[PDB]
Design a protein around this ligand. Structure first.
Ligand code: HEM
Length: 153
């Protein structure tokens, strides 16, 4: 359980993300794909991309960054009361996309990296620790639902 103050730090920096969801989503996915290229294999429409400029020009990558950040922002705004939001996401990521928890760790790392890079004044130690706790809670809860669905990833 995060404190109310921790949730407010999470949501304060998330408002900054919402000023340009697509640009943030591009930076986060490009960071993920650069730092962990095996993750790029999961995206059929993006897996041929080679350079940073190609990734920034990609309409498919830009759309998918928005898909991810829209779902995650709704989850964060539930302040841990996210079972109904995780249920469809666990469903598809366990049984169709087959996204192991370690890949969710990689993308959480990329999110933290981009938020620190773009919003350092709203992402000091207090806010980083809160965001870390929020993403850890997301990964804990979705791992439990993965297993309920028969997926040990
Ligand atoms: C914060 C973590 C994530 C969130 C909130 C998220 C959210 C979503 C949403 C809402 C969709 C579309 C609906 C669906 O299929 O469930 C989606 C699709 C997908 N996700 Fe995730 N995702 C996350 C992490 C990841 C990661 C780390 C990977 C792979 C490394 C991944 C792989 C995919 C793939 C392959 C699709 C299908 C894309 C397509 O064919 O259009 N997801 N994700």
């Amino acid at each position: 359980v995060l404190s109310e103050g921790e949730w407010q730090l999470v949501l304060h920096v998330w408002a900054k993300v919402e000023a340009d969801v697509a640009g943030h989503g591009q930076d986060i996915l490009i960071r993920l794909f650069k730092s962990h290229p095996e993750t790029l294999e999961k995206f059929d429409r993006c897996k041929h991309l080679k350079t940073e400029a190609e990734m920034k020009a990609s309409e498919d990558l830009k759309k998918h960054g928005v898909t991810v950040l829209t779902a995650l922002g709704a989850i964060l705004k539930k302040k841990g009361h996210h079972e109904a939001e995780l249920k469809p996401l666990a469903q598809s990521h366990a049984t169709k996309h087959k996204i192991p928890i370690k890949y969710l760790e990689f993308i959480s790392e990329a999110i933290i990296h981009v938020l620190h890079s773009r919003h350092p004044g709203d992402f000091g130690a207090d806010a980083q620790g809160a965001m870390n706790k929020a993403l850890e809670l997301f990964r804990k809860d979705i791992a439990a639902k993965y297993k309920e669905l028969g997926y040990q990833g």
